[PDB]
Amino acid sequence: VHSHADGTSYDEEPYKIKDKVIYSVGFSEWNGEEWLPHIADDIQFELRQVDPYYRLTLSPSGNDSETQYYTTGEFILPDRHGVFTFLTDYRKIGLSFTTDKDVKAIRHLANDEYPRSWEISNSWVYISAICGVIVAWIFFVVSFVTTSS
Amino acid sequence: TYEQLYKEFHSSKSFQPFIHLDTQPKFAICGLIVTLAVLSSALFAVGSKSSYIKKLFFYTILSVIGSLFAGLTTVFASNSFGVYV
Amino acid sequence: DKFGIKPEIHHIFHAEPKRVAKPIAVIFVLIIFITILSLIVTWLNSCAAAFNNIPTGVTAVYFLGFIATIVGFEVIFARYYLGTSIFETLFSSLYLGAPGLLTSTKFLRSFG
Amino acid sequence: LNWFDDRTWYPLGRVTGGTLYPGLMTTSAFIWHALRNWLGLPIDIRNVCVLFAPLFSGVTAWATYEFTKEIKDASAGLLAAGFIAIVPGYISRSVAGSYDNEAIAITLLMVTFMFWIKAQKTGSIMHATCAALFYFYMVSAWGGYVFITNLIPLHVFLLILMGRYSSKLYSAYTTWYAIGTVASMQIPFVGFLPIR
Amino acid sequence: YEPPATWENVDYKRTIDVSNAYISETIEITIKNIASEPATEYFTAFESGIFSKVSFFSAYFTNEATFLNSQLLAEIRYGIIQFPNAISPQEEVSLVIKSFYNTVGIPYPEHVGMSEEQHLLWETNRLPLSAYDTKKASFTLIGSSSFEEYHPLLGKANGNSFEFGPWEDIPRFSSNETLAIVYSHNAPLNQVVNLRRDIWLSHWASTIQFEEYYELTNKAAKLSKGFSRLELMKQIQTQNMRQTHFVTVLDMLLPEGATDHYFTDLVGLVSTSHAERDHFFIRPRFPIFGGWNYNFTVGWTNKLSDFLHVSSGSDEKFVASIPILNGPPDTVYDNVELSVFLPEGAEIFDIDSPVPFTNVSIETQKSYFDLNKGHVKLTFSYRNLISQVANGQVLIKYDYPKSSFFKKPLSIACYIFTALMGVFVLKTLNMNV
Amino acid sequence: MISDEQLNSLAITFGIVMMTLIVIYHAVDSTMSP
Amino acid sequence: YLYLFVFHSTWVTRTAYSSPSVVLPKLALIDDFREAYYWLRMNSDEDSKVAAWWDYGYQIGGMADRTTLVDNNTWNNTHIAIVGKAMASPEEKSYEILKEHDVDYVLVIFGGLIGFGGDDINKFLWMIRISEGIWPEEIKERDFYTAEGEYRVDARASETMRNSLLYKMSYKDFPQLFNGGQATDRVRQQMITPLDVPPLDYFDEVFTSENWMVRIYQLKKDDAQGRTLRDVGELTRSSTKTRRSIKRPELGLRV
Amino acid sequence: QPVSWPAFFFDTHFLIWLFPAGVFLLFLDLKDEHVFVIAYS
Ligand SMILES: *[C@@H]1O[C@H](CO)[C@@H](O[C@@H]2O[C@H](CO)[C@@H](O[C@@H]3O[C@H](CO[C@H]4O[C@H](CO)[C@@H](O)[C@H](O)[C@@H]4O)[C@@H](O)[C@H](O[C@H]4O[C@H](CO)[C@@H](O)[C@H](O)[C@@H]4O[C@H]4O[C@H](CO)[C@@H](O)[C@H](O)[C@@H]4O[C@H]4O[C@H](CO)[C@@H](O)[C@H](O)[C@@H]4O)[C@@H]3O)[C@H](O)[C@H]2NC(C)=O)[C@H](O)[C@H]1NC(C)=O
Ligand SMILES: CCCCC/C=C/C/C=C/CCCCCCCC(=O)O[C@H](COC(=O)CCCCCCCCCCCCCCC)COP(=O)([O-])OCC[N+](C)(C)C
Ligand SMILES: CCCCC/C=C/C/C=C\CCCCCCCC(=O)O[C@H](COC(=O)CCCCCCCCCCCCCCC)COP(=O)([O-])OCC[N+](C)(C)C
Ligand SMILES: CCCCC/C=C\C/C=C\CCCCCCCC(=O)O[C@H](COC(=O)CCCCCCCCCCCCCCC)COP(=O)([O-])OCC[N+](C)(C)C
Ligand SMILES: CCCCC/C=C\C/C=C\CCCCCCCC(=O)O[C@H](COC(=O)CCCCCCCCCCCCCCC)COP(=O)([O-])OCC[N+](C)(C)C
Ligand SMILES: *[C@@H]1O[C@H](CO)[C@@H](O[C@@H]2O[C@H](CO)[C@@H](O[C@@H]3O[C@H](CO)[C@@H](O)[C@H](O)[C@@H]3O)[C@H](O)[C@H]2NC(C)=O)[C@H](O)[C@H]1NC(C)=O
Ligand SMILES: *[C@@H]1O[C@H](CO)[C@@H](O[C@@H]2O[C@H](CO)[C@@H](O)[C@H](O)[C@H]2NC(C)=O)[C@H](O)[C@H]1NC(C)=O
Ligand SMILES: *[C@@H]1O[C@H](CO)[C@@H](O)[C@H](O)[C@H]1NC(C)=O
Ligand SMILES: [Mn+2]
């Protein structure tokens, strides 16, 4: 399963470029009678379009009675939009092979999600000028009607 | 009950349409002309340059007939074009 | 080595564009403020725009409506700039222009 | 406006927002919503898109009538409307089912040239503003708006060489430009191009 | 659950006709009473699985056409039969219990070529699994040209029948044994996963419009080695009127005097349709092979005079009998939603359905020229309906006063009048400067 | 519904009526107005 | 003159500008496009990818409602070139290029049975030219012509044309349609025999329209035992005669 | 992709010749709107 840094699932809030995401998986090993946690140190998760954009080694983070849980950090999605694949491929010669892939769509920044004018110190000037011109026009209309020629 | 209703449903009276569908086109056309005539007069009433009271008392009385005819004409034209109401 | 551990890969993001230091952008806001104040003083004290010929009869209740229309549109735009939706802005404009148009065409008809 | 479809150009995707003129779809959706709520007719959307060009060919006819009533006389406007109502050169691209930019555009072209001629021969600022508004309506519907932005200046330019400059020309053209150019940069597709 | 063991069967004649796309079962009984109490009820045992899918359950005395009250309950399940004359402590009464199950046997090879005949594997109980001790019993299969047991209490074929009788006394609730049998089938075996009927009644035009949307699928043996258009054309070229297990043409049976038929798809309409003599032949775009889907729409119009009767009690009280199904001759429906749309002013007064429904709802849905509030929409939901067995007419009594009849032109005229008054207002207002 | 030869006749009739009304209007306007 | 103009206009619009596009009208109706698109829509997985030339992407995505690879608004020429290089390369290279982009089905247009003329084989040369400006050392346009300079689909055709993907994916089972094996194309007017068309080892045919106008193939999943699909094919096909002698296979060193 | 001459007659009947004539007549009065019309033409 993958999700936002704060737990917000994908369906609740689709992904976009430069959005912190986390990924987690679990591995279990059968030994004849019952399952147990599988402890390995070379497993890799890949986020790829047609080529790997992210390739991270999964690190042990949590445990349980029958499985062992691995997870990447809080990595930041790339700045390229498109339909990406989160895939974990465990292929160790000797053991069973396991593939888990999910195809999601990383969107682009919407016209709403951009630092507003008041947040940028570079645009205080232009907004101040717009406000000044609108207030001078408002005082000019009044003084043009009120006064006589 | 289902049997009581099923027996009620066999009452010799059957549905008889108010205005047969075969003669609904004709009516429509007829209605149309009236809907076009009276309505148009009302619109011309505006701009007469008479008193406001006269141009209102005339516009309303001409529209309370243009509308009444246009509603029926619309129903009949809809029915005749295959979209039933 | 076709099957085995492989080296990692991390994306490389670009550096977002830099924003001018704050103390260098407040001076220009102050310049613009002083400029607007000077404009208003130039009008108020150059014998122009002197506040005479103010209507006070029945047409005054129309003059205020005229002012109410103008300033109200600039308030709607302000609200819109602050986050209000576009449909709410259109509906507000409709509601405020329906009577405002009348009151502000009557003011102009009464003021010769 | 913030659509991003993954069902096209599969790996790469299409942003759509910056590669699409949202003037025809917006008009279609508005007519659909209006018919659905204000008239009681819940017409399908496929019938609102198949019968869009025929419905807007009578609007192009009225636009031609109004534009030709300013050049000569009303009778000439009626003649021009009758001609353009059925001329094949327009029917080729306005046939029912042709749900493309041109159907709407070629109406907005005439609706804009009628206001530019009213403003250019009256000097009114309000008519120049209407011309600018419908010009913006066109930059957001068809990629051939580059016609207007290059044919309205020429006109003015010509009138300057012929020694026919008048305050009406200044008023009309400066209003049209000031309004339309700043309103045509708001269309994500056409953005910053007018200046560069 | 365990019901009272107050009945001793002296015969059990269970026949199963596999001829069509549903299982039709018939149980002839000559039940007798044991415990010394006048009783009026009788239990019939179904398994859990087959009980989940039961499309019709009828009972009746063999003497005449008297349908005894029979209801399915609401881990073998039970149906209950209720008698009108409680039987004496010792009495012998014969009965016929008919049932229809939506289940059919699964394709045995699963993958079969375009022209090979297909076999189906169907597994059920062999010994009579009832809630009482039976004295005699039999069992018979009919409806296939070839029967063959799977991994064999054996049967002796008699023509196209496969009779095997465990005649000797049997302890009740004998469920240990399972009987799997493969038969031969050469019918498309088509099933409708979803149906959305819509009947629109109109008093002004005096017409009833039917419109159905079918989500169909053939669940026969899949096509091995993909689909080859050349093999299909070759078969068409030589195999004249040869039975097949794919769907080429469907035959919808509409009511008498239908008009303005139409057959549509989700990508425009289909031009391969032909309506003759209360019949409508429709050919899909592609032949529905085993495991393929096809979602489509059919529509037609009828005179409202032969579906709506006027109550003689009050001239403004109407009754309606509307069929439940009108479709292919041998189909199966896993879900039906019968919606009836009555005019803008109706007021439902009474409702009756011949077969049990799963949910009935009343709402409103606006349509063309519906300004105040939409048509009254009454929706019935059904689960397991079979084509020829699910006969019946839903009956709907309602009210429609003349004042609601004439309210439609009045609403349209009110809209037009308001528009005219607004035009007048905005045309007689000085906005000049 | 309506066939194709009927819609052709209808289109032609609409066109002819339009062009005749236009000619009548032009004649009236040119003869009764300087 | 006015009335004559009205008549001329009505005639021109009824004769020249009133022809449908999805249905193709001795003088029967041909509805192969909608048939194939609807099959794709109803009997394919909802997340399948369809790979076809860029001319039909908008209908393949509007009527079939499936993910495509290239549309009519060609904004990335390199993607149209990747898609054109996979319909011109040997079946193995085509399988690789398509699988690497997660393609599920492949849709070709063939009008050789009823003389359509706008089929895929006609625009093949453009598929070659667009995919030659990016990989000039792999797809050569002069290798599809005969030794003389002719574009031939007959027996005399080049081995490169005979081995391309579009060729054996469009002309599959076409000779065996007409008895005697003497199938005669109707757009190029050339005779085809059963030997001219080599078998397909990597793709399965899942649908062919009624008039053989649209053909839909599906990429088969890689072999479980991890061998080349071509060897699997040659094993099932040429089974009656195998090398029953035992000889060291002359492999390389096992890592 | 240039167009041949018959298409101009195909798309406009009886109105192809009148177009130059009208440009001329509109070049005889030469008002302000007529300059726009001529440039367009
Ligand atoms: C239109 O459609 C077409 C077709 O679909 C699109 O064309 C494709 O575009 C892709 C990217 O836009 C492109 O992929 C890149 O190709 C580069 C070219 O490599 C070629 O040469 C090398 C030898 O040098 C061969 O091995 C290779 O096979 C090619 O023949 C590659 O260099 C790119 O690799 C980098 O990115 C991938 C995935 O992002 C990584 O796996 C790989 O390791 C490289 O990653 C480095 O760079 C990224 C940032 O770009 C870093 O995040 C990462 O950490 C690595 O950083 C190291 O290297 C950088 C310097 O590069 C250094 O600064 C840093 O410190 C590290 O040392 C990548 O594979 C396709 O080839 C191309 N296909 C075709 C057919 O053209 C086209 O984009 C579309 N147009 C659109 C959408 O507008
Ligand atoms: C100033 C304008 C004056 C009028 C001028 C123009 C009108 C003339 C038009 C000619 C022919 C039109 C009809 C096409 C043929 C059938 C179309 C069809 O069949 O399509 C219909 C769409 O129906 C429409 O919406 C057509 C509307 C009817 C038009 C009638 C004309 C009157 C208009 C006056 C409006 C006044 C408004 C008053 C304000 C309240 C789709 O039906 P369906 O798929 O739901 O199937 C129905 C089957 N169920 C119900 C079972 C699902
Ligand atoms: C300010 C306005 C004040 C007055 C308000 C009135 C407005 C107009 C109201 C009604 C006029 C008809 C409206 C469309 C009805 C046809 C729908 C259709 O497309 O029908 C087509 C038939 O094609 C036609 O006959 C086209 C001729 C009729 C339309 C042209 C006349 C009116 C055009 C101007 C209005 C267009 C508005 C929508 C487009 C923007 C079939 O449709 P289907 O394939 O679903 O078959 C449905 C039937 N089965 C499912 C049973 C098979
Ligand atoms: C006498 C008083 C007169 C008042 C002025 C009246 C009219 C002004 C004339 C022209 C305005 C030009 C500027 C356009 C801005 C559009 C607002 C908007 O498109 O919404 C924008 C969406 O951004 C965009 O993508 C703009 C892309 C433009 C696409 C528009 C589609 C073209 C439609 C053509 C006409 C369609 C008519 C259909 C029926 C005929 C914001 O919407 P938001 O809800 O996110 O709020 C956000 C509040 N922030 C801004 C503070 C965060
Ligand atoms: C600004 C104004 C613009 C004016 C011009 C605009 C549009 C007109 C141009 C072209 C129209 C295309 C014609 C398409 C017809 C296809 C459908 C068809 O073929 O209907 C014909 C029938 O026709 C008729 O007899 C209709 C005759 C009624 C005359 C028209 C009434 C006036 C309506 C206009 C005013 C409405 C409001 C008035 C008050 C506000 C076939 O019916 P059916 O067999 O398919 O189904 C019907 C099934 N039964 C047969 C069982 C019923
Ligand atoms: C045409 O009608 C058929 C018959 O109902 C529709 O098939 C249904 O399609 C939906 C989605 O395409 C299937 O939902 C799926 O369910 C599985 C669970 O089995 C789930 O894992 C998937 O994510 C998806 O939600 C549904 O199962 C399927 N029904 C049957 C009986 O196969 C088909 O969608 C209709 N097509 C159109 C274009 O209307
Ligand atoms: C019977 O009625 C409807 C059948 O669709 C269902 O109840 C409603 O279901 C809709 C979903 O389609 C919900 O939005 C409503 O909130 C439900 N309740 C009501 C009162 O409308 C359900 O299948 C059944 N409802 C019952 C048994 O109460
Ligand atoms: C997690 O802790 C250890 C893992 O080494 C072991 O007790 C077991 O796997 C887990 N125990 C609990 C209580 O979760
Ligand atoms: Mn276009």
Numbering used by the authors:
A (entry chain G): 270 to 418
B (entry chain C): 2 to 86
C (entry chain F): 173 to 284
D (entry chain A): 67 to 262
E (entry chain E): 25 to 98, 111 to 188, 194 to 474
F (entry chain B): 1 to 34
G (entry chain A): 458 to 482, 489 to 718
H (entry chain A): 352 to 392
The article reads:
Oligosaccharyltransferase (OST) is the central enzyme of N-linked protein glycosylation. It catalyzes the transfer of a pre-assembled glycan, GlcNAc2Man9Glc3, from a dolichyl-pyrophosphate donor to acceptor sites in secretory proteins in the lumen of the endoplasmic reticulum. In higher metazoans and fungi, OST is a multimeric complex composed of eight subunits spatially arranged in three subcomplexes that are formed during OST assembly. Subcomplex I contains OST1 and OST5; subcomplex II contains OST3 (or OST6), STT3, and OST4; and subcomplex III contains OST2, WBP1, and SWP1.
We identified two distinct functional states of OST in this sample: A binary complex containing bound LLO (resolved at 3.0 Å resolution) and a ternary complex containing both donor and acceptor substrates (resolved at 3.1 Å resolution). In the structure containing Dol20-PP-GlcNAc2Man9Glc3, we observed well-defined EM density covering the catalytically important divalent ion Mn2+, the four isoprenyl units of Dol20, the pyrophosphate group, and the entire A-branch glycan, which includes two GlcNAc units at the reducing end, four mannose units, and the three terminal glucoses. The Dol20 lipid reaches approximately halfway across the membrane and is accommodated in a hydrophobic groove formed by TM6 and TM11 of the catalytic subunit STT3. The pyrophosphate group is coordinated by the manganese (II) ion and the STT3 residues Trp208 and Arg404. The A-branch of the glycan revealed a stretched or extended conformation, oriented parallel to the membrane plane, and is in contact with OST residues over its entire length. While all the nine hexose units of the A-branch were well defined in the EM density, we identified two regions where the glycan was specifically recognized: (1) the GlcNAc2 group at the reducing-end and (2) the terminal Glc3 moiety at the non-reducing end. Close to the active site, Tyr521 and Asn536 form hydrogen bonds with the N-acetyl group of the first GlcNAc, while Thr537 interacts with the second GlcNAc unit. At the non-reducing end, the terminal Glc3 are accommodated in a binding pocket formed by the auxiliary subunits OST2 and WBP1. Specifically, the terminal α,1-2 glucose interacts with Tyr383 of the WBP1 subunit via CH-π stacking, whereas the penultimate glucose interacts via hydrogen bonding with Asn75 of the OST2 subunit. Binding of LLO to an apo-state of OST leads to the formation of an “LLO-primed” state, where EL5 and TM9 remain unengaged and allowing access of a glycosylation sequon to the active site.
